Amino acid sequence: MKYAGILAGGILPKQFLDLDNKPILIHTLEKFILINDFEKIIIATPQQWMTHTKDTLRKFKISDERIEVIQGGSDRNDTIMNIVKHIESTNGINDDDVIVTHDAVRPFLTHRIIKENIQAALEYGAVDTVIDAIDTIVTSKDNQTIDAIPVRNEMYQGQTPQSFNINLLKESYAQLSDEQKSILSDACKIIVETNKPVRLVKGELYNIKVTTPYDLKVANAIIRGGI
Amino acid sequence: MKYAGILAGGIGSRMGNVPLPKQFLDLDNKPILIHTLEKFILINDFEKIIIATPQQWMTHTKDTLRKFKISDERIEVIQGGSDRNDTIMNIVKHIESTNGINDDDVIVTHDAVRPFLTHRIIKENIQAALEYGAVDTVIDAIDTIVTSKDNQTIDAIPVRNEMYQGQTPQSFNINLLKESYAQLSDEQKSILSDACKIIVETNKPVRLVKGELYNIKVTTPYDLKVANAIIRGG
Numbered sequence: 001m002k003y004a005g006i007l008a009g010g011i012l013p014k015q016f017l018d019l020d021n022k023p024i025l026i027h028t029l030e031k032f033i034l035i036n037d038f039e040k041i042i043i044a045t046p047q048q049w050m051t052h053t054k055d056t057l058r059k060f061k062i063s064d065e066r067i068e069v070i071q072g073g074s075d076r077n078d079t080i081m082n083i084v085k086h087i088e089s090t091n092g093i094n095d096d097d098v099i100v101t102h103d104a105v106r107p108f109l110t111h112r113i114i115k116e117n118i119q120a121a122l123e124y125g126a127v128d129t130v131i132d133a134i135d136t137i138v139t140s141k142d143n144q145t146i147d148a149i150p151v152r153n154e155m156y157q158g159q160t161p162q163s164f165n166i167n168l169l170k171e172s173y174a175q176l177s178d179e180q181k182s183i184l185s186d187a188c189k190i191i192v193e194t195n196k197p198v199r200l201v202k203g204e205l206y207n208i209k210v211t212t213p214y215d216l217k218v219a220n221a222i223i224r225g226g227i
Numbered sequence: 228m229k230y231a232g233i234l235a236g237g238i239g240s241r242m243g244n245v246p247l248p249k250q251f252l253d254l255d256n257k258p259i260l261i262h263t264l265e266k267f268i269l270i271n272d273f274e275k276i277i278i279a280t281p282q283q284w285m286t287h288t289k290d291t292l293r294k295f296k297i298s299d300e301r302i303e304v305i306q307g308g309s310d311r312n313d314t315i316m317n318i319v320k321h322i323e324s325t326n327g328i329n330d331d332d333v334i335v336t337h338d339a340v341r342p343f344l345t346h347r348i349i350k351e352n353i354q355a356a357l358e359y360g361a362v363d364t365v366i367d368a369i370d371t372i373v374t375s376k377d378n379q380t381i382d383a384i385p386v387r388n389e390m391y392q393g394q395t396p397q398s399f400n401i402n403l404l405k406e407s408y409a410q411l412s413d414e415q416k417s418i419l420s421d422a423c424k425i426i427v428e429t430n431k432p433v434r435l436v437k438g439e440l441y442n443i444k445v446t447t448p449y450d451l452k453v454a455n456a457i458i459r460g461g
């Protein structure tokens with residue numbers, strides 16, 4: 001079975017800001033609603049915003065019975081595991097279950113990205129949505145001087161969705177210590193650190209994350225430009 | 228002395244590595260190249276602003292300078308090289324044959340299609356190059372960076388706090404860059420697309436100067452639409 005997990009547990013908080021007279025969260029959700037194969041599309045948000053989010057869905061005439069709003073966690077991976085735990089306590093986990101986890105503030109993902117994510121999770125178990133690194137990547141351990149500059153052709157910018165077999169995600173995450181979880185910049189590293197493969201799905205240059213005011217200006221350009 | 232080297236070699240196509248003259252595309256009724264140059268003319272401390280571009284584009288570059296009334300006596304157009312680093316060295320060699328290199332000379336090298344750099348970025352580059360010899364303009368990674376050696380599976384996912392997206396300008400004390408570059412083999416002349424990697428690979432420090440989220444490289448139609456937004460709005 002196929003599940004969507006829309007991650008709105010972050011901090012008016014950026015996931016509810018208006019983008020073209022419709023909240024960013026709604027733009028993303030609309031993309032997930034058009035996929036009929038999700039058994040449930042689970043939105044996780046902070047406790048104080050859950051009823052407000054449900055109300056905002058009602059405001060935009062979205063009544064799809066597949067949508068459930070749940071309480072998120074204290075960090076991003078805590079939120080993903082909250083969604084899996086909700087699934088486990090509601091439906092139980094099937095051996096073939098997959099979860100498509102996705103940033104609420106990335107409203108410009110496409111049908112193709114979701115379908116490739118779904119298919120990639122079913123076939124290989126774990127997948128990251130990426131594009132070729134737009135810049136040369138440079139590293140630093142002191143924030144003052146370069147430590148290393150890797151070969152540019154091996155570098156990718158991680159985006160979302162990130163998609164997983166639910167049992168694989170649960171068991172892998174269960175293996176990590178609290179310190180090992182302290183560094184995880186994303187969810188796919190849970191899998192990498194537990195020595196299972198993570199597949200690549202190509203994103204889009206316009207699949208941006210709205211985290212600064214600049215990103216909202218770029219997003220407005222993306223929407224008015226139709227892309 | 229302080230020199231600017233504006234790198235106008237084009238943007239290579241995935242298949243063929245054909246140079247496309249993206250710097251001549253229109254951004255609000257002025258070529259991208261003209262916006263970038265206008266940013267450099269405002270820095271009074273530059274002794275020369277040398278644009279190096281392929282031989283086949285030099286006349287059109289000069290014609291474009293004329294059409295947009297760019298009359299600054301410091302602007303000069305020269306022939307570029309076989310790759311980005313060879314073009315940088317074409318600029319260095321031109322400086323040496325014209326004025327001669329001083330021990331304190333620095334060169335601020337910059338992508339022609341990065342028109343949104345700021346006065347602060349340029350001044351900080353100059354100061355950092357004078358004091359420390361080598362500088363990369365960078366921003367904190369916003370995305371998690373992931374690696375792949377086969378374009379199919381992840382190889383590693385490093386700590387995001389240590390990852391940065393490199394931009395330009397990249398600025399160097401000229402004799403230092405020359406000495407470091409002179410240390411590289413003919414083979415390493417092919418891999419190193421980046422100019423700061425010359426220095427890193429030759430075991431000299433490179434300072435970080437922080438860039439801007441909007442200091443984008445205008446290389447795609449998508450990037451061009453966003454650039455039109457950035458420009459119209461500030």
Ligand SMILES: Nc1ccn([C@@H]2O[C@H](COP(=O)(O)OP(=O)(O)OP(=O)(O)O)[C@@H](O)[C@H]2O)c(=O)n1
Nearest residue numbers: 007008009010011073074075076079103104105
């Ligand atoms: N405990 C958390 C933290 C983040 N996210 C979501 O992960 C996505 C990525 O946003 P990010 O860049 O990681 O930043 P935030 O943690 O949301 O907030 P800040 O801008 O302060 O970093 C966001 O949609 C966020 O809502 C989440 O679901 N639960």
